[PDB]
């Protein structure tokens, strides 16, 4: 237990179980509801069901993260297995991030140009948009296979000494710090749409009663536009500053930036698995159709 102190690993494994059985609950429920009720198969629920797939696959890779977090040593599970867990989770965050950018564009056109004909991306070509997103999700996480892999200590017996780490060729060449700069445009480019398009949507909706209860309904709307913008900032700014300190930690003669990467990448651990759980909530909790569909599915209301 050289990584973190002994009770501190125990508190993360407790709160990640609670994010597990809640994250897979609301994510299974979104795929069940859109499949059974043909009336709920809108364009918005087709983006949310593929986003419910990414938050289901991320939580399947969560057992392997805790055995790596409690034991970074040895790691004798699989020399080719740990390439896959790092590939599948990191390809899923690309898709999740780019789905949140996809919902921000479509609820821009639904509200800011409500009578528009929608010539470019029709409902039939929405299914093709989800395949372009998962194409860029799988190619941009593609270089994980060259980058990361099990690595033993030079000249030692590797039965108790391997590490699923970025191997020595990647830290030498500089291929790692290229990867962080390419992983960062999955943070800067959605935040330049989530904070631009949602600040233009609230520019229209606050123009309403200037142009009683109608005020109260557009006050709960921008209250929901502020939550899904700030919860993207809250979860993904510990992430991308977390893996930037990881890349700079291998720069020669640096220890003061190394230990900050131990703790920024631990508070980025929980917020990354919190965002996979509350993404079913934030998009499906003010929908009246969805709530009567769950009760019609469950049989209790």
């Amino acid at each position: 237990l050289q990584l973190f102190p002994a009770p501190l690993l125990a508190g993360v494994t407790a709160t990640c179980v609670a994010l597990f059985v809640v994250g897979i609950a609301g994510n299974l429920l979104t795929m069940l509801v859109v499949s059974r009720f043909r009336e709920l198969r809108t364009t918005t629920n087709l983006y949310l069901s593929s986003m419910a797939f990414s938050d289901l696959l991320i939580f399947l890779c969560m057992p392997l993260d805790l055995v790596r977090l409690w034991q970074y040593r040895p790691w004798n599970f699989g020399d080719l297995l740990c390439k896959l867990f790092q590939f599948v989770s990191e390809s899923c965050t690309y898709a999740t991030v780019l789905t949140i950018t996809a919902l921000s564009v479509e609820r821009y056109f639904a509200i800011c140009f409500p009578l528009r004909a929608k010539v470019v991306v029709t409902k039939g070509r929405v299914k093709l948009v989800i395949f372009v997103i998962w194409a860029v999700a799988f190619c941009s996480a593609g270089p994980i296979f060259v980058l990361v892999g099990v690595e033993h200590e030079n000249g030692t017996d590797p039965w108790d000494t391997n590490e699923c780490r970025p191997t020595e060729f990647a830290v030498r060449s500089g291929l790692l710090t290229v990867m962080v700069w390419v992983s960062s445009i999955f943070f800067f480019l959605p935040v330049f749409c989530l904070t631009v398009l949602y600040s233009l949507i609230g520019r229209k909706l606050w123009r309403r009663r200037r142009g009683s209860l109608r005020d109260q309904n557009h006050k709960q709307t921008v209250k929901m536009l502020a939550v899904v913008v700030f919860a993207f900032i809250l979860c993904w700014l510990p992430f991308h500053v977390g893996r930037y300190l990881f890349s700079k930690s291998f720069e020669p003669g640096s220890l003061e930036i190394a230990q900050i990467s131990q703790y920024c990448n631990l508070v980025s651990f929980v917020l990354f698995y919190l965002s996979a759980a509350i993404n079913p909530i934030l998009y499906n909790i003010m929908s009246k159709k969805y709530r009567v569909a769950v009760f019609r599915l469950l049989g209790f209301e």
Partner: peptide, 15 residues
């Protein structure tokens, strides 16, 4: 997902 090795800094002074 989002760590350095438990024996990180001592091998970097050796490299």
């Amino acid at each position: 997902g989002s760590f350095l090795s438990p024996e990180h800094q001592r091998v970097q002074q050796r490299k």
